[PDB]
Ligand binder design. Structure first.
Ligand code: ADP
Ligand code: ADP
Ligand code: MG
Ligand code: MG
Lengths: 346, 350
């Protein structure tokens, strides 16, 4: 007697059939566990597609979690991130070839193509093309920083409200969405955690996890400290208050702000130099300004200096050494930095 | 008073200056922690260049370990892997732009370009193009498997002899080196460990390190099993004998053999299907043949069947469930699979 075969179960999104998707050859890029491609959905919709790397441990499971968090965000925080269009799962026989424009075997996630340009690419081209992409009328460091940070902090606040910590906030993961007025949208929930039981936490555990070293405080690569209890439906709220995992995003947002506000900090080496000096003076912005800024003769800190040093103060709040002292993204949003100009004389 | 500052320090290899390197846009590939590009050195030497990914934690440290291991291999096991040409470190102001064909800020590693096609690429195009690339006169599955495995196992034996476990053995990390008679060379020591204190172990720790699941036994994604002693100068030799981290490479080599030997196993899905069945029958090759091979009417196991099933037996040796039973790469080399046939080549022999 031989064991019988049986059907394969495949995950599918209503309205999305494999026949509807053409994949464009050539990866947009690759992350720790997956690869991203451009595609065309139903003949005339520009989309982006992600699959799991065949050569990476647990890649499918990592992509499944990214899927779960994408559904959560789609339901609870629309507009914060690239629009999620669901998934498509293919078997081996029915898998095609990327270079021939067809989806290969495995799980694929699909989003709208929100734009060809990331904030990292734009800022490095310059403040002008960045402002243009963002539809930002004040095409200065201060202007783009105000608009971008209001949008970023607003979106992070909404994500945190529904229990999601993004965990990979940085210019490379922001797109100025031209079809939506240039507003910034986050991408890449590949490292995101769901930190409340809805119905269960996801990708949320004690100890260090994936982090971009440029945008994570070097001694804080965790959402929950290594000593923390494992999260459960019963202790999740307590852990959120105790360990403030959302403050991981706050620090990253501060890094974004520094790069938007100061042209010389837009290279990796530039921001790295700043953060090393910032740590050296005890994560004290005023100490940096007094002891270190004189060393930065090739840079212009005017955007941070403006209006009683409002920008510096906001960076300080977002980048306090201690999480318990560090501003939430919601609180940061109410900062003087974002105040409307008084008496504009129209 | 003001702090005085001072010069930057940059790592360099004598005879290799960044002005002499042109980088070609378009990553050749990207792994877990780095990105590889084609380059041209001194206007006419085809090279390959690797830097760290800026977005990956400690990619910097991983690239440094890859560098160290490459220096070790260059000194102790020449010809086993792509020829290592050294490092080039660039600073901020002297750093360039990939689009301008210049090396960017940070540490770079450089190797000779050993060939445009990997064994993975070749085998999937067919045994014929693979055999041609390997200069393999016997252009059959058996022929290419014999020649490739002799070369691979020989090189793994040399690497293990100098304390190095490659940890990423697979067809994608083998190149048939056109300029050295088609002989296979390993690439990508990015996951490699130096497992002996020479003078210090490198990238060697208990627990599931990086592993390509296709080429790693599902429950053996480690070199050293967790909890077991952290590697130190005086427990190193002990751990080598006890946990046999080199047998990680043995299993991978078995996977390579399966794909070389059986065309149907050259796809990810094909090899995956086989290993699942192999696991299902208790990692017993004869049981697979007896209970399962009837389900593989799509495929041809002739290369493994040949000569009293010598190929099957070598696979069994390289792929024992238990490391304590699994052949070393050195031991595998003397297997009957590699024997010359009686009177082989008699018709032209002098
Ligand atoms: N929804 C989207 N719309 C437009 N572009 C996207 C979207 N999602 C991802 N991308 C792009 O896909 C790419 C992913 O590549 P990335 O992770 O940066 O690879 P690497 O780390 O090798 O640079 C990024 O350039 C990103 O801008
Ligand atoms: N020394 C070398 N000579 C020629 N090609 C090389 C060398 N080192 C690396 N490469 C090529 O660089 C590429 C790295 O790509 P990667 O994504 O790391 O692996 P994969 O082939 O699994 O995608 C490989 O295609 C490999 O053939
Ligand atoms: Mg003012
Ligand atoms: Mg760098």
């Amino acid at each position: 007697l031989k064991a019988r075969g049986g059907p394969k179960t495949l995950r599918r999104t209503p309205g999305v059939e494999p026949k509807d998707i053409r994949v464009l050859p050539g990866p947009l890029g690759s992350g720790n566990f997956g690869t991203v491609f451009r595609g065309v959905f139903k003949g005339d919709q520009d989309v982006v597609l992600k699959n799991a790397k065949a050569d990476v441990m647990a890649a499918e499971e990592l992509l499944e979690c990214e899927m779960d968090v994408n559904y959560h965000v789609h339901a609870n925080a629309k507009g914060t991130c690239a629009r999620f269009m669901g998934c498509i799962e293919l078997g081996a026989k029915d898998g095609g070839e990327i270079y021939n424009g067809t989806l290969t075997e495995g799980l694929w996630l699909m989003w709208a193509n929100e734009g060809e340009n990331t904030v990292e690419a734009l800022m490095r081209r310059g403040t002008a093309p960045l402002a243009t992409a963002m539809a930002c009328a004040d095409a200065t460091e201060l202007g783009v920083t105000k608009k971008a940070m209001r949008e970023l902090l607003g979106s992070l606040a909404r994500l945190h409200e529904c229990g999601v910590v993004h965990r990979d906030v940085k210019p490379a993961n922001l797109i100025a969405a031209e079809k939506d007025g240039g507003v910034l949208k986050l991408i890449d929930l590949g490292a995101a955690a769901l930190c409340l039981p809805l119905p269960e936490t996801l990708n949320y555990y004690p100890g260090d996890g994936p982090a971009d070293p440029r945008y994570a405080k070097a001694d804080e690569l965790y959402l929950l400290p290594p000593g923390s209890p494992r999260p459960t439906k019963d202790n999740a709220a307590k852990l959120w208050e105790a360990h403030k995992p959302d403050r991981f995003d706050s620090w990253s947002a501060g890094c974004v702000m520094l790069q938007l506000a100061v042209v010389g900090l837009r290279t990796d080496a530039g921001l790295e130099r700043f953060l090393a000096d910032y740590k050296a003076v005890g994560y004290d912005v005023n100490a940096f300004r007094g002891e270190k800024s004189g060393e930065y003769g090739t840079m212009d800190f005017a955007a941070l200096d403006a209006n009683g040093g409002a920008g510096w103060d906001l960076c300080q709040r977002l980048m306090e050494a201690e999480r318990d002292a560090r501003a939430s993204c919601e609180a940061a949003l109410s900062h003087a930095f974002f105040d409307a100009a008084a008496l504009e004389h129209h």
